[PDB]
Write a protein that binds this DNA or RNA. Sequence first.
RNA 1: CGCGGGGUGGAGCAGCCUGGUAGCUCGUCGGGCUCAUAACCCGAAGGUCGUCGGUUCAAAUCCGGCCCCCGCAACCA
RNA 2: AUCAACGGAUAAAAGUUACCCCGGGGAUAACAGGCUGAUCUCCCCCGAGCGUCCACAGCGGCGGGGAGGUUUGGCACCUCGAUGUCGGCUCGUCGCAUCCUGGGGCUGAAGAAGGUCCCAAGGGUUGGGCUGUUCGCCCAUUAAAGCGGCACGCGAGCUGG
RNA 3: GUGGUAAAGGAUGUGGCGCCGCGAAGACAGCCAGGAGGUUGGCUUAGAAGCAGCCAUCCUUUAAAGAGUGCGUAAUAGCUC
Lengths: 106, 122, 37, 136
Amino acid sequence: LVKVNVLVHGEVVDALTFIAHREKAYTMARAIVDKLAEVIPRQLFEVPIQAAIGGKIIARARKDVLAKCYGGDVTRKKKLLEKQKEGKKRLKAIGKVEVPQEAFLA
Amino acid sequence: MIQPQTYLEVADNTGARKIMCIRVLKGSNAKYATVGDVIVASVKEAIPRGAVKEGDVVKAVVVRTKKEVKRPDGSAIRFDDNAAVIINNQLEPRGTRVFGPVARELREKGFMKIVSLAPEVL
Amino acid sequence: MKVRASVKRICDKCKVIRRHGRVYVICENPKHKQRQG
Amino acid sequence: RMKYRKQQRGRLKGATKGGDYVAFGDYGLVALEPAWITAQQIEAARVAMVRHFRRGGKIFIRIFPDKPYTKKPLEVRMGKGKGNVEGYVAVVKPGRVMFEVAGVTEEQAMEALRIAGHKLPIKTKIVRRDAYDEAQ
RNA sequence: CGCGGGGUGGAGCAGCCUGGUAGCUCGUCGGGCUCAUAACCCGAAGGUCGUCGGUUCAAAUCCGGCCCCCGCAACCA
RNA sequence: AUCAACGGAUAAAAGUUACCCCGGGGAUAACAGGCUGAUCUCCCCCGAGCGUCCACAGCGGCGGGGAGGUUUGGCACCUCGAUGUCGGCUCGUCGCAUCCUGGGGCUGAAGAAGGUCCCAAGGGUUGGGCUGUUCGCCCAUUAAAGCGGCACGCGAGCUGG
RNA sequence: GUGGUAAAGGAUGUGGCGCCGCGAAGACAGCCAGGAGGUUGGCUUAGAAGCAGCCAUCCUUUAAAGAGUGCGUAAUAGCUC
């Protein structure tokens, strides 16, 4: 029966996982795990909430300023491209919570 | 008679006599909110404790204050614009509605029971 | 299922087709639309 | 990957015609007048190979990895003197002999060769034992 | 996609740029002061110098490009 | 004598202009044109290994072929004796590789529901919420609520943030 | 409607060409009845005793000799070949 869990950037997530018996691990993985996407996205980080059932992960479930200095500089584009790129590393980390549970449970 | 959003009188189960409208309920293009129709709308005014509270709702016509015609060319105007309220697809929340006899109302004939419930004076 | 390409006799034994200039294969099974056309 | 410990940092170019030869082991392939082929793809062969030969039928691979390529940095504009690196290929022109001996026997390769044949960016051809050679 | 700034004993930097040689601090092992602990007295202890591949009779070092960290850069279009 | 911006104007030498001017020139950009098609947009190809019996309903890892030419640019010869350069309303229209309605195929299809795949422009294809925005989110939806063309349709017709 | 700017790979397109299955004691079919007679699993035996997940390497007939290609589950049937 084991105890198939799940993963979601954070940890422990809502409150799933039971007992994956008879390959039942991935059996429902591509099902429940792929919970659409919590209906709500919250931010543009795109956290990857996998399924820490008991591995070894299993399941596998941003402003637009860049184009404004138009017509040139595959240079300066990059300059302003890194600015926000740094936030992600400082966001997902500092941006505690990021847990939008209590959606539909499906 | 017709309306997108507007001030239109509810006179129904709101805790005060008004609802803001949203729009016509069926034909995509239509603009006009013809009578004998159900509508999306909302109250803006207050309530005494009550029930329905603030939020959103779908529901129906009463009167017009802008020219009807009958096939028998009966006619009937009224410088005021109340309209019906409904829960779900169809049934009428409040079991109370003061209003008169009137003509166009039942004629959609999707909700016959109502007619009894608003028969009277004023 | 008009596939664009390939087609290599997949209802096992199967008939090459020549019609409307178009060229296909049908065998015993509908679950074998080898119309690369 | 498959290259190392470079003499330089960037070859020049050419491509016109060349010469390989006989098979080693009475199973093999050969092609036409190839453009360079990336190593992944080159390695992909054996990668594509391994699964199919009894998912184990051992085979010598083939030709060695070669030339550098790059978009300098990326897609800014020329300004580079011509540098930076990533991918490697093969000298490929008369239709080089491909190496495919195993003992894994018959069609299992021969269609894997078609697998290979369907693989790789050049029309090819299919070969085995034929007519020897000799060397001192 | 440039730069200029550099990566060192547990941590801290000194020490190097001036080819044949790393030091100063607490914290540190064991030891003195005690009803017990701090204080306070002492010892000893211990360093591929981010990699690397090279110049070199030899490289912490000279030198080069890969690896992280600092800062300057990134125009009117 | 690093006069090494090393054939050197001095022997001794910084900037800043959006307060600028004035000349000249397409013998260098910006929007645009076109160029090839790099990146993108899409379609096949191989078939792993999956997905109650499955390689080829469903998909597609590792790959390849493209095509196409709207974004990224590289370009740069039309031009500097005038290519007025964002969205917006107006009124359009081609194109389909379709987004809703046609007609099928196919089901891991009882059937309705659906999914997926062909072939086809007659049409049609919303009002708002808020910011310069297309875009995007959303609210009710409603048969449905598509891309993209056309100097990023549209200044001798405007708007003008 | 190939001329008519395209790859890949498909293609019993078609053409003629050389190389190899005519066995007129006569074939590959297409046909029709047989389509094996001790040809039945020790490892699943939930049945496989070909026709799910587990060996095919010797005789009987010769009509041919399917170690068995097939559709699948109570073996099995039952239709191919």
